[PDB]
Design a protein around this ligand. Structure first.
Ligand SMILES: [Cl-]
Ligand SMILES: [Zn+2]
Ligand SMILES: [Zn+2]
Ligand SMILES: [Zn+2]
Ligand SMILES: [Zn+2]
Ligand SMILES: [Zn+2]
Ligand SMILES: [Zn+2]
Ligand SMILES: [Zn+2]
Ligand SMILES: [Zn+2]
Lengths: 76, 379
């Protein structure tokens, strides 16, 4: 299934995903497209911070739904 | 006189009206300002919808007050326990079909030990036990999924169950407009207050514009009962898909914005940026570094939000009527012996040794796949 990842900046990232894919796998799929290390990445769905070990099914994220991408910045 | 209008934004804009200007005329002003038809506009002021014959003065609308404008165009049959949000072709709330499959093989081979009696049984995963009828498979638990029943559906073409929406069978008046509409949204407040889908749109849209949605880190961004009842926040947040794609995306955007803040970060202050930045616990310098996105790439003070410096900077009566709960037996359809129903599950088994008819409590027919699909349990 296809999902989207939007920054509050207005940038939309297209991901190919499964409902069984963890937030950790999703964070890995973002790094493979945008080169952002997953420790910098923080995902939000419907105002809730998504935890690494949970899946897409667990938050009920559907085919063609959007997650928000927010960034932890160091040095911041 | 200047009154401030919020129309699908938390950014209020000024409008010039007089004390004797009617709400019909206020609507005409807003219609001209947004290039929208006036008949499609609803005026909401401090929870109440203002009607067309009232004047600005009557509604106690003083200089620099906030009004909202929400654009809104004006046995035999099936009984539906479950409603879903069909993302297409319907793009709306439709009655759905409950389905089962094995947790293991993910096939319709799992025969349940007993049927679901409530939403917890079908919403919490691996809460129900059964036996997979396929030979080589150790499937002990069931997996329930929902489908839109309005059209013919594919295997993987599932939809989120909107467990709050119920068909208004007992003809309960809405908490806000006091009318009888169906389906309704039923809140999980102790009074189980019922709101029609039109009033619910008005409640969410105005609350969104006001930034009056609640943030709970363990839930996200939601709203309680209209009446304000404690412990009543909407838990399944796809319920807001009822507002339509445009409002839903705005709700998701405001929610992410509230989430960032609740986590202690910041939003980039530069025009049109607003990047969700999470600076380290002890930081005053924050850099909107993107290079792609969240590319700004501004460096600002976490406090003053200027460029980084070094130094310092409801009706009680209506609510009473709008409650979901405010005769015990049915005969078996074959032997006519009355049976008392225990719990919410619709699958009855006659205890008469000569009979033992398996039938639907709701329909009074023998138990089938349609009754399981349409209403395995009652609400
Ligand atoms: Cl009422
Ligand atoms: Zn549909
Ligand atoms: Zn199986
Ligand atoms: Zn209503
Ligand atoms: Zn309530
Ligand atoms: Zn920025
Ligand atoms: Zn400062
Ligand atoms: Zn019987
Ligand atoms: Zn039935």
């Amino acid at each position: 299934m296809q999902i989207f990842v939007k920054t509050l900046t207005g940038k939309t990232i297209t991901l190919e995903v499964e409902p069984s894919d963890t937030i950790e796998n999703v964070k890995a799929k973002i790094q493979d497209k945008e080169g952002i290390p997953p420790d910098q990445q923080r995902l939000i769905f419907a105002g809730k911070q998504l935890e690494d070990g949970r899946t897409l099914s667990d938050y009920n994220i559907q085919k063609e739904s959007t997650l928000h991408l927010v960034l932890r910045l160091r040095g911041x | 006189m200047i009154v401030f209008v919020r129309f699908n934004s938390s950014h209020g804009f000024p409008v010039e009206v007089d004390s004797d200007t009617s709400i019909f005329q206020l609507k005409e002003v807003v219609a001209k300002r947004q290039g929208v038809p006036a008949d499609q506009l609803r005026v909401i002021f401090a929870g109440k919808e203002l009607r067309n014959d009232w004047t600005v003065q009557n509604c106690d609308l003083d200089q620099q007050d906030i009004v909202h404008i929400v654009q809104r165009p004006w046995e035999m049959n099936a009984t539906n326990s479950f409603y879903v949000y069909c993302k297409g072709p319907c793009q709306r709330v439709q009655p759905g079909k409950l389905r089962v499959q094995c947790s293991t093989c993910r096939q319709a081979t799992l025969t349940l030990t007993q049927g679901p009696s409530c939403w917890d049984d079908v919403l919490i995963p691996n809460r129900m036990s059964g036996e997979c009828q396929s030979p080589h498979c150790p499937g002990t638990s069931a997996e329930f999924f929902f489908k839109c029943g309005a059209h013919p559906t594919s295997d993987k073409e599932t939809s989120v169950a909107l467990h709050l929406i119920a068909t208004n069978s007992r003809n309960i008046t809405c908490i806000t407009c006091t009318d009888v509409r169906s389906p309704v949204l039923v809140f999980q407040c102790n009074s189980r207050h019922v709101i029609c889908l039109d009033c619910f749109h008005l409640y969410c849209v105005t609350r969104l514009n006001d930034r009056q949605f609640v943030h709970d880190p363990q839930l996200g961004y939601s709203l309680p009962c209209v009446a304000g009842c404690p412990n009543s926040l909407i838990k399944e947040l796809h319920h807001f898909r009822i507002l339509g794609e445009e409002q839903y995306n705005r709700y998701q955007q405001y929610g992410a914005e509230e989430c960032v803040l609740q986590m202690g970060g910041v939003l980039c202050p530069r025009p049109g940026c607003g990047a969700g930045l999470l600076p380290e616990p002890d930081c005053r310098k924050v850099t909107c570094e993107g290079g792609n996105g969240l590319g700004c790439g501004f460096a600002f003070c976490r406090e003053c939000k200027e460029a980084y410096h070094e130094g310092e900077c409801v009706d009680e009566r209506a609510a009473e009527q709008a409650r979901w709960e405010a005769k015990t037996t049915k005969p078996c359809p074959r032997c006519h012996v009355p049976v008392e129903k225990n719990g919410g599950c619709m699958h009855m088994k006659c205890p008469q040794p000569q009979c033992r008819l398996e039938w639907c409590w709701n329909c009074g027919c023998e138990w089938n796949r349609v009754c399981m699909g349409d209403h395995w349990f009652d609400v």
